Amino acid sequence: ANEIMDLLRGMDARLQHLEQKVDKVLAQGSMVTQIKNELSTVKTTLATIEGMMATVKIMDPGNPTGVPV
Amino acid sequence: ISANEIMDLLRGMDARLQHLEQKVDKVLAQGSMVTQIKNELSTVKTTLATIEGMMATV
Amino acid sequence: ANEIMDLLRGMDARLQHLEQKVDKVLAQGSMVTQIKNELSTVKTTLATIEGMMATVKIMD
């Protein structure tokens, strides 16, 4: 009779910390979002470096400049 | 009498499971975000690999 | 009563569905491993780049 109710509260309790463990992982996305925001700046600085290298490469006078189309 | 309290606790169980469902769906969404960051960072890596070469010739 | 236990047969069926779905959520392990590998690679390759940058020669 009452034993089943006892184990029932036991289940409620178990699930209650299921929430906690999950609450933690949901809160783990904080970096994921920031790292995306800052990776945007990493991307633009990378692109600038790549463009500078392309420009210096084509600045050599041995091989003349050929524009696509 | 007890069956009424049991009804309430089991209904609360259902609600708790719905909460877990939503939270873990948000976890799947975070996973979609991390996969986007995956492909984009791979593109960044490939670009950096492409530039290391000119480093010497120039 | 009986109605409640039928509601729990439905609800824990939803529970088996929940665990089935989070089985897919488990997949990001090797995923984060891969992303760690790529960025570490990025770090190593930019190491070479900064290494060759500091030099006495002037670019021609």
Added chain:
Amino acid sequence: SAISANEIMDLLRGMDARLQHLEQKVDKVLAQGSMVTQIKNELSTVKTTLATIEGMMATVKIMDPGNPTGVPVDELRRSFSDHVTIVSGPG
């Protein structure tokens, strides 16, 4: 009530097992956020060093030696004679 008894048996023991797998799953995924914040720090270091190399690259010297010794043009032609299609900037 015995029928209800084994019905309970099935409904409870089962969900208990499922929750056991569930707690094993979260136990396995708890390290993902930690390794993520590591990747965060290293990524910040990468951003810092990429920024400083951009800083050094903002100031570079490009020098053309020319023909100082006056060596003949005959061997001096070390250049490709054809237009080469290399994409620069946009493309």
